[model samples]
Structures are given as structure tokens and as C-alpha cells.
Target: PLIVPYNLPLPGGVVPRMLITILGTVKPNANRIALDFQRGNDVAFHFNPRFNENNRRVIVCNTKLDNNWGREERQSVFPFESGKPFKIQVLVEPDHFKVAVNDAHLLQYNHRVKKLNEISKLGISGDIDLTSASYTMI
Candidate 1:
């Protein structure tokens, strides 16, 4: 699990072309893996992969604002396999974030909150062994 300090200055903060990489291995009985980008108390993006929640073939995307959950975007493509090592890359774009899993493009989440710099929190947790994580600016 990795929880980076919120609002830590990152150059100009999540600018375009910036990349966030997460390397991890999923547990055999993994139920869920979540990567959240937060600002203050609201979550700008909720990247969640659920193994057995509401069935075993879905990835859910959502936003949390003022402690309330927004509409979920469910993806049926189950790109993650249990007990397998995976690399996830999040590319920050001008108006959205593109995510790639295991080096393959997976999904894109449009920016809901306009202030990208305020989204300074990175959280990773649940049923996985995170080997490494890196934030790179390009």
C-alpha cells in the first residue's frame, strides 16, 4: 500500500505528459485494487478493479465529491489476472487521464475537477503487493 502526502508540490503538479506508474502483483484471492486521486476531501478519480464484486468481470470507474459517489463507469474487460504481476501507467493529458495496464491501453478518465494541481493525493491499497511506483514528467 502507498499513500503519498496530499498537496505535495510536484513541479507544476499533474501536467500533460506526466506519467504515474504502479507495479504490483495481485493476490490469488484478491477482491479489489483501488487507485484514487484526491483533492481536499473529494476524489477526482477512483480507479477500481474488482475481482469478485458484483461478479468477476468488471472494472469500475467513478468520482467521489463531498463524500458522495458519482455514477459508475463499468468496464467488462477484465485485464487483470489473479496471481499475476502487472504494470499500470497513468498518463496525464490536458483534459483527461489515460490508463494502460500491462503495457496495453485500457481506459481513459476525463477530468472532473478543473484544478489539476489540487489533485495531489495518490492512494493505492487492497489485495495486492505493490512492488514499485514512480511519477515521471515528460
Candidate 2:
């Protein structure tokens, strides 16, 4: 089983027309989870799913550069639940990252760091049990 706070180095880096998938199960008392793409120590994309924050569930998308985070683009179209399985897919397009949860189109975040191929790291952490994660170039 893959561990939480899991980190992987993308072999060829992330490029356009690539698809990344993560399979996992939320913890029985899950409160949050984060999926991030990085280049060196800077996060190119920050995808966070908050199960409960101020009595609400939200998906917060943003970027972190030079250790500073950008403004968050929050959404409320949630699909996963505590103590359940989730299939998350990220399609790296030329202009943006397309995200889908459990095969449902969730939300897409625009490219902020701009150097797509430079993103060589993937990280998943927080309250969940990871089964598998992979990337495909197509």
C-alpha cells in the first residue's frame, strides 16, 4: 500500500497531453487531502480537497511559487466522502490542468508556473489511504 504524504518524481516530467491518475480511499475521519505538482521546491499546481472547513466542503486550487501561494480558486462541486474510494484524474492540457474526481469532471486550474515539462514531482497527503498513482503520456 502506498503511504500518505506520498511523493514521486515524474520520470519525464509533466507535459501537455499527459494523464495522471490517483486511486485512494478516504480515511473514516478524513477532513482534508492535497494533491500537488512541483518543480524543485516550488509547487506548480496545488489541488486541495477540504472535507470540512467552517461547516462547508470545498475544493481549493492554487499555485505556490517561491514559497508564496497565490489566490485560491475555491469550488463546491464535491464528489468524494469520508470512508469512501476516490479515483482522481488530472489531464495536463496545453493551457490548463483538467481535474476529475471519480470519473466526474471536477474543476480545471490554469497554468501558473508555465513551464509544464519542468514539473517533475507529484505529492499526495492528508487523511486518506493511497492504493496507486500513475501517469501516462498520450
Candidate 3:
């Protein structure tokens, strides 16, 4: 059971080149999990893995601003398993964010909040047990 959202500060905020690593395990009966890179009310990146959203299986990536979501990028390859720990790596680039799960390439999301530096906070929520989340400047 998720009681609170996990928050972390992005040191210099995400620049042109940076990396974020997350380690966690999905709840045994998780319905969904969302990892968000946010700036105030604007979300620079929304990485969500839905185990059974509408009975569909996919990973959805998008951006949100003022409660509105932008276009979504969906991936069919599901690399996560319930009750199993997983490693997720995100590389911040000039135009997009490249993500990998469990050492396998996942998906890329183009920047919606163009000013990367404004993405100063990290938020994780949903049915998952977070172990560690770290940032690396590159």
C-alpha cells in the first residue's frame, strides 16, 4: 500500500545530459505505477507502466501541464513484473528522454516542457515499493 508520494530534488535540475536511476519493486497486485519529473505544476515527463489499465498492457509516456496531458507514447513491450524488483534508467537529452528497464531499452519521450532546467523535482507514486532513486550528472 502506497501511503505517500516519494519526492527527490534534482540537483541542477535536468540539463541537456543527465541520468536518473530508480530501483523498486511493484506491488504483488499493482494496477499501475507512475514516475514523474515535475516543475511546479508542470510535468516534464510522466512515465507510467500500467499492469491492467482498462485491461490493456503497455507503458505510457507523456507530459502534463495545468492538469492537461499531452500526446502519449505507448510501448507494447512490458518489462516489469509484479512483486519483482526492477531497475529503470533515464537519460536526459536535449530533445528527448531515453529510458531503459532492467537493462533493456524501453522508450524515448520528446521534451514537452522545453526548458529542462525547470524540471527540478522527481515524484514517484502508485503501487510500488521504492528502494532507491538517484540522479547522476552527465
The number of the candidate with the highest lDDT is 2
TM-score to true structure, per model? 0.90, 0.97, 0.93
Model 1 residue 48 CA deviation (Å) reads 0.4
For the record, the alpha-carbon RMSD of candidate 3 to the native fold, in angstroms, is 1.9
Q: Taking the tens digit of each residue's C-alpha lDDT, what string does model 1 give over 1-138?
A: 444222223355577888998888888987888888878788888889988875666789999999999999888777898899999999999989899998889999999887998887777777788877779887
Q: Write the per-residue lDDT of candidate 3 for residues 1-138, one digit (tens) a residue.
A: 234379888965899768899898888988888999998888889999999978877899988889999899899899999899999999998899999999999998988788887889999888888888888877
Q: Which candidate has the highest TM-score of all?
A: 2
Candidate 2 C-alpha lDDT tens digits along 12-118:
68888889999999999789999889988899999999988998999998998899999999989988799999999999998999999988899989998888878
lDDT of 1 at 115: 92
Report the number of clashing residue pairs per model. 0, 0, 0
Local lDDT at 137 for model 1: 80
Candidates' C-alpha lDDT: 0.82, 0.90, 0.88
lDDT-best of 1 and 3: 3
Candidate 1 TM-score, true structure as reference: 0.90
What does candidate 1 score in Cα RMSD to the true structure?
A: 2.7
In model 1, residue pairs whose N, Cα or C atoms come closer than 3 Å (at least 3 residues apart or on different chains), thus clashing, are none
